[PDB]
Amino acid sequence: ATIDNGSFGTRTIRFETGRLALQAAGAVVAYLDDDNMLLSATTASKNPKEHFNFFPLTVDVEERMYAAGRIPGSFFRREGRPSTDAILTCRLIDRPLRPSFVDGLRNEIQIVVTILSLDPGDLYDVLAINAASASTQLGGLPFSGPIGGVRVALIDGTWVGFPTVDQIERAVFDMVVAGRIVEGDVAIMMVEAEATENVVELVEGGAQAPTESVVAAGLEAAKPFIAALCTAQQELADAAGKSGKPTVDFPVFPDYGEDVYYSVSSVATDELAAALTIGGKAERDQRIDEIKTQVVQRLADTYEGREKEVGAALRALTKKLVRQRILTDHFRIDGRGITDIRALSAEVAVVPRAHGSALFERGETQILGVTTLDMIKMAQQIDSLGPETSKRYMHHYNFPPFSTGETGRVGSPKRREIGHGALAERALVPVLPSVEEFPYAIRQVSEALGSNGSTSMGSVCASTLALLNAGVPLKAPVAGIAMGLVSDDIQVEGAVDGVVERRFVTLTDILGAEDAFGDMDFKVAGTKDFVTALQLDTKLDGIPSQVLAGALEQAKDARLTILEVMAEAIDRPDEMSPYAPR
Amino acid sequence: ATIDNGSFGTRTIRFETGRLALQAAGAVVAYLDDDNMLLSATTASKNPKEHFNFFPLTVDVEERMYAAGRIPGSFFRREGRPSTDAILTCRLIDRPLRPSFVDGLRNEIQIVVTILSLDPGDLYDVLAINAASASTQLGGLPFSGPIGGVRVALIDGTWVGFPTVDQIERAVFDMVVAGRIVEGDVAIMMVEAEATENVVELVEGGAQAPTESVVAAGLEAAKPFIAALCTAQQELADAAGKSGKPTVDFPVFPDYGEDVYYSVSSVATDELAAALTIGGKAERDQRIDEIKTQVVQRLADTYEGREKEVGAALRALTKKLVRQRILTDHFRIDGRGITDIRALSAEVAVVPRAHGSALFERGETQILGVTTLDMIKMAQQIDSLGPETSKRYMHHYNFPPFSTGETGRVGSPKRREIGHGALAERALVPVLPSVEEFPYAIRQVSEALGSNGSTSMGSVCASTLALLNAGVPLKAPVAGIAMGLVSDDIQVEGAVDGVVERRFVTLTDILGAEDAFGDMDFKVAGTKDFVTALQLDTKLDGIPSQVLAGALEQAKDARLTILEVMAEAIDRPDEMSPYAPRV
Amino acid sequence: ATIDNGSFGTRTIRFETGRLALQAAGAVVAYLDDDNMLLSATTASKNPKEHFNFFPLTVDVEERMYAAGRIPGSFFRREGRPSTDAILTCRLIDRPLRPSFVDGLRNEIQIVVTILSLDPGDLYDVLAINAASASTQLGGLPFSGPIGGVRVALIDGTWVGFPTVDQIERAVFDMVVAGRIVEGDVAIMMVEAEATENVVELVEGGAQAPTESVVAAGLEAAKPFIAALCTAQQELADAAGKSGKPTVDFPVFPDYGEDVYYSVSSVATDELAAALTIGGKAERDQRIDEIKTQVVQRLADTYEGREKEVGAALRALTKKLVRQRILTDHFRIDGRGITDIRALSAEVAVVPRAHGSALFERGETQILGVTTLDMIKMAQQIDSLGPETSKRYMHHYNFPPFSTGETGRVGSPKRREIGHGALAERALVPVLPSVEEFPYAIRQVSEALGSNGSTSMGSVCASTLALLNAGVPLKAPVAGIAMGLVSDDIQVEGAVDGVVERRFVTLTDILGAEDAFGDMDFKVAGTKDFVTALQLDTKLDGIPSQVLAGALEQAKDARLTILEVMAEAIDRPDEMSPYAPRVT
Secondary structure (H helix, E strand, O other): OEEEOOOOOEEEEEEEOOOOOOOOOEEEEEEEOOOEEEEEEEEEOOOOOOOOOOOOEEEEEEOOHHHOOOOOOOOOOOOOOOOHHHHHHHHHHHOOOHHHEOOOEOOOEEEEEEEEEOOOOOOOHHHHHHHHHHHHHHHOOOEOOOOEEEEEEEEOOEEEEOOOHHHHOOOOEEEEEEEEEOOOOEEEEEEEEEOOOOHHHHHHOOOOOOOHHHHHHHHHHOHHHHHHHHHHHHHOOOOOOOOOOOOOOOOEOOOOOOOHHHHHHHHOOOOOOOOOOOOOOOOOOOOHHHHHHHHHHHOOOOOOOOHHHHHHHHHHHHHHHHHHHHHHHOOOOOOOOOOOOOOEEEEEOOOOOOOEEEEEEEOOEEEEEEEEEEOHHHOEEOOOOOOOOEEOEEEEEEOOHHHOOOOOOOOOOOHHHHHHHHHHHHHHHHHOOOOOOOOOEEEEEEEEEEOOOOOHHHHHHHHHHHHHHHOOOOOOOOEEEEEEEEEEEEEEOOOOOOEEEEEEEEEEOOOHHHHHHOOEEEEEEEOOOOEEEEEEEEOOOOOOHHHHHHHHHHHHHHHHHHHHHHOOOOOOOOOOOOOOOO | OEEEOOOOOEEEEEEEOOOOOOOOOEEEEEEEOOOEEEEEEEEEOOOOOOOOOOOOEEEEEEOOHHHOOOOOOOOOOOOOOOOHHHHHHHHHHHOOOHHHEOOOEOOOEEEEEEEEEOOOOOOOHHHHHHHHHHHHHHHOOOEOOOOEEEEEEEEOOEEEEOOOHHHHOOOOEEEEEEEEEOOOOEEEEEEEEEOOOOHHHHHHOOOOOOOHHHHHHHHHHOHHHHHHHHHHHHHOOOOOOOOOOOOOOOOEOOOOOOOHHHHHHHHOOOOOOOOOOOOOOOOOOOOHHHHHHHHHHHOOOOOOOOHHHHHHHHHHHHHHHHHHHHHHHOOOOOOOOOOOOOOEEEEEOOOOOOOEEEEEEEOOEEEEEEEEEEOHHHOEEOOOOOOOOEEOEEEEEEOOHHHOOOOOOOOOOOHHHHHHHHHHHHHHHHHOOOOOOOOOEEEEEEEEEEOOOOOHHHHHHHHHHHHHHHOOOOOOOOEEEEEEEEEEEEEEOOOOOOEEEEEEEEEEOOOHHHHHHOOEEEEEEEOOOOEEEEEEEEOOOOOOHHHHHHHHHHHHHHHHHHHHHHOOOOOOOOOOOOOOOOO | OEEEOOOOOEEEEEEEOOOOOOOOOEEEEEEEOOOEEEEEEEEEOOOOOOOOOOOOEEEEEEOOHHHOOOOOOOOOOOOOOOOHHHHHHHHHHHOOOHHHEOOOEOOOEEEEEEEEEOOOOOOOHHHHHHHHHHHHHHHOOOEOOOOEEEEEEEEOOEEEEOOOHHHHOOOOEEEEEEEEEOOOOEEEEEEEEEOOOOHHHHHHOOOOOOOHHHHHHHHHHOHHHHHHHHHHHHHOOOOOOOOOOOOOOOOEOOOOOOOHHHHHHHHOOOOOOOOOOOOOOOOOOOOHHHHHHHHHHHOOOOOOOOHHHHHHHHHHHHHHHHHHHHHHHOOOOOOOOOOOOOOEEEEEOOOOOOOEEEEEEEOOEEEEEEEEEEOHHHOEEOOOOOOOOEEOEEEEEEOOHHHOOOOOOOOOOOHHHHHHHHHHHHHHHHHOOOOOOOOOEEEEEEEEEEOOOOOHHHHHHHHHHHHHHHOOOOOOOOEEEEEEEEEEEEEEOOOOOOEEEEEEEEEEOOOHHHHHHOOEEEEEEEOOOOEEEEEEEEOOOOOOHHHHHHHHHHHHHHHHHHHHHHOOOOOOOOOOOOOOOOOO
């Protein structure tokens, strides 16, 4: 509940309950220095639904303008659709909460958090995640927590926790870390990391560039704060310790109950690894399609009408066996090694009559990036509880239905599009030129012509290429890449008895299936000198520093390779387009 | 069809049909003085649906800008979403129409009324309800009407019917009354009453304040107009008399057909009143949960798969028996008396960094009110067929899903929120300070932290508290309260044979269950001197003046008690907030 | 792929594939003179749905502002809802594509076409339809094409193909023709025709007015271009010839499989034409309702639970027999002749307190038109990839649910409303007065009080009446009308054996049932001198010029009759309303 950062004063987080929203299943009011107020209320449905196929969890943040003491500027004088920052905060709170419930739950859960009072010099995302975690812990649901989040910024080589807006502009790197306590040592679920806007000028004058070692040190520094916050959530003045409640059982719907495993694993486990050794896309299935058909045919003698259960058992068995094959043989599905990158192609000036256009292809990902320019008056004007009003860089991300082959309805973007666009924009901001040198309004649009998985950083590279082609002077090109990590308790029979120990394997250019098979995923973006944007999320209970460092160096090597590949086409700013405005 | 108010000329309402919209089931064109034109068309579906659980009735008013001779100001030059006044009129017409059809109907009904020509000095809500009632009467549906609505304003001690905008600003009280004819004497279903903006200055100079006796006199004065309008609807030039049509039977889906009553009322009617005498919230059920389980278990021998029917029979039997217990023992479910008010709590300056903030709790209702101020330029700009353009007082009402414990989707407000917010704003307007003395833009927001039933006037009191805390000088604090009334034909055995006669009981602070058990509900809001906002709606066929007057005095006493309770915390305007703007 | 219009240079259309959007079922990039770029991608669902009752086909055009090199003017700086021109183009591409698939298909089909680069002096609708047709041909679906579209404008008596914006303002008539190849000669499915804004001044100085013969000549002139475009689609550098793909079978759900016909046609075919000879609206059914009830009752012995199949068989049999009766007896259902017009009524100044108001009734169609005026500042401001920015004439079309008797939800307009409103506005534009003479903002609204079928041109006439009543000086009143055509292979037994030959019958004032029974429908609008708006759509494989010409003259006669009927009420501009605003 208390944070001492050293010479920058102290911060206090307070958690109150029992006074507001008594009718809800759980409700917690969060105080930041008795100056910021917010309220989190979580309720659960009574009768679960059965037609749905996943866990129906909903999050709703509500920014209210009366906190800022200003009537809304809308024509009808009312706050309507959620803002982009609200959607980003909703995603940030939802991400470390879904992998914390009992699998297969069916009762609907809704978490509503509303801003009550906001200091103009502070932000509310971390307070929001803390209050939501405390409320859902007090709710009484099968929730495996509590979770704790901390925001830490690097200034003058020091990692100060919970910085304000007046302290972040003079920082070189910012962390938002969400983790829990397993046995006393923290276990991080997620982290979101961004470099500030003026990092280049700061590091030029003597400051330390945000390299990978600094990132690891920053991730290490945030653990005591998370531990203190979790302890406060557990045993504050009004916490779960003083408000013990009975736990009500919730019905759980599993994919396979008890028996389909004891059949399939004993009848359909010949090799289940040699069928995937063909290595040809046109001959991918080639053996195990017949295996699946024969299994679903000949097993239709004891379990009738339960094809979903047999499908779930088959897919789970295949996933486990390919995981074991990955761990032992170090042989990927596509035949690539653990440090291989798929085929690359970069084309410049593909769309005519445009200020800048480029096409970037990696494996199956294929992204077309277009950039335009106009008068400086065209900058976006926004107003919310946040301290941001102007936005000279407008990045839009489009994921049409025909990218993945399915059919749907083209229309309003989802939250995933907002998240990916925000991530790419925040990765590309720090290298932008100054307004005085280059006064213009830059609108970059990235359309997903073809997708297979992890296509955001392909869009990042394509946007860099298009910005360079348009003639915009960038300080240095910025690349991106995605990496995965599989950790498992493997058994070696060299001793008696079989010794079980944890082993880690890091993979490059993970597809959707690769992400499904793995347990940790992360994405690294940056330039030749330092990283800019980082996003990590997993469900492990600990990780040695050596393997994390090695994965970071592998990511750096892959990013350098991608940068060198992309620099072959165009490495210098191009001539201004005749249609561009002066 | 004709209204003679005395020295203020006469008004004429005309109902025409047979010329427009022949394809519809019913269609009526309404003329107001041959200067206002509107059209009402009602149609019914053919095959009723079965998955729905209530009566699917829809109302749609359509304000068209070409009546005002002005191109819409929208960017796309088209009238899109309905306006707030349209939603209010939709609610006003829908309210006295739902309790007029055969219960359990399943065929969808849609009533669409569109404005065709509007005089800038007149309103259209009462003409709308009249035209819709006439059209649905001509449709041929199982509709028990017709209904009639009248607008009556009090000026110079006289109740003039159908006032214009140039006559309402000099009034002290306004009535909209909707009623029908049962045996010759009118039977009012609904009434909506509001005090004007400049009532204080008018009553200060010699006019009569709108007290409860004046309200009763005004409600009494509107009956002849309703009778004349109903007679015109019945027997005008083009009415139901000259346009007789066959009545087509519509399938009716009941909760219990014929037999579940003869079982449950004979096997599960031991006391059904002693089980609710526990009086503890944690021990509320405590006897009748087991009764319900045993009834639904042991009766699963003749009716299988009809648990909905047995549930409906059980709930109806319990409602009837608790109604009888209320009538005879005068003992409420919670143990409170017929003139009791639940626990009260008022807190001021609860939300920091705000111009004004307050919290008000009554029983289970818990409302947080916040008020902010800004420049006078921030006044809301609107434009419609109505004569209103500016709105210095902006009241918003929020009902989040977690107030009542359920889960839903937070998003666009429904019509109930619009109605409650409009009611609270109209109740709080007349006491506002003048623009010259207090030039500011006032935006009040009321969020329902906790709800149990009838939480709008809790929001009214909370908004009054927040406005006082912000430093806004109000003429007098304004309170609100809700009351219920149960009337039933009780039998006394003191004579031979058993004498059946009507008895009335008035209850204070009605919950949802109390509203379900009763037959009449009303809500009274106002200050220590006079009332401001009134809303009444019921389904009775008559009421003596004495019981209505007594209920009004009981409401006045409860409102005075609430005002005295709330005045203990803060009774004077507070200091201006340092974050507030100076203008 | 190449268009030579004579002295106006040449145009080139290029179709590329295999480079973009590989994951889709089909994808084609379209080049217009290497200056306009667009992309069409079509994909199909895997498992078809069964609860739906029609073919689920969706079209989506996407105008992207980065083609014009301009940040969107929206508050959130993003292109949101589709524009009116986008909806019109969506309808224009969807219309000649639905009657080209195997009937009863259930797999969902989605066609998404996005603008990539647009020349400010060119349009994209015809390139859009061409690219979509090529993509759906390359997709591998059961698609009976390919289709070709051509835009042809008449300037100086010459029909130049693919005109630009700098060439259309000096034209007298514009055609968009979509047709295919059956045996070598083209077969037109659809055509959309409009007269330019300044046609009156042009034809006054010596140019030829766009009469019916000129329309027929223009429809004849566009065929070689369609043939060349279809040949290019078939055998270009990257076309279906070099990209042969297997055809995957798609399940087909029919209304009646094989047997219900052999029962109903043998047991319930006594006359099926005498039951409809009553001629009274209140006694319409009067015989065949009992026939339907007895058929559905006594046949419930072999097919149980298949009432939908028996209903489909009954309705199909009735349609075929009434078609034969129409062909042979020349006797319509309502008893009217082949050149009859239903009852007409026109009323002026019906809605009080309005600049102009009128009511027009024809048969069962009943339309109330209202027109208002305001300051010239009130002109609509729009911005898109198109070259249009201002719109002084704003026509709105409303179709409330209670017009046809059903119940629904009143709200956002559908695409049909947009299409009908755009058609009426484009028909009424060329006769509008000049801005300098009549500086005002004109907003006309047409509400469908009662509808039976083909009620758009009733709205056109009502809007003309209301504009005349408001005092707006029009050059000449404009009327509209709808006509149908039924062509069938009838057999005459005067020779041995029975000689089968094609016969055509043209009908006036077609209702919904008449449109269902027929095979060709068209709508003609215009003034006493020339036509303005034309819209034709059918599914024939050829038509002689003589019958088309005769149908055109019949339409002209009906339009003249309607004009003479409507001119009886008011024929001159009326006095300005006291509520109207004055600009002086």
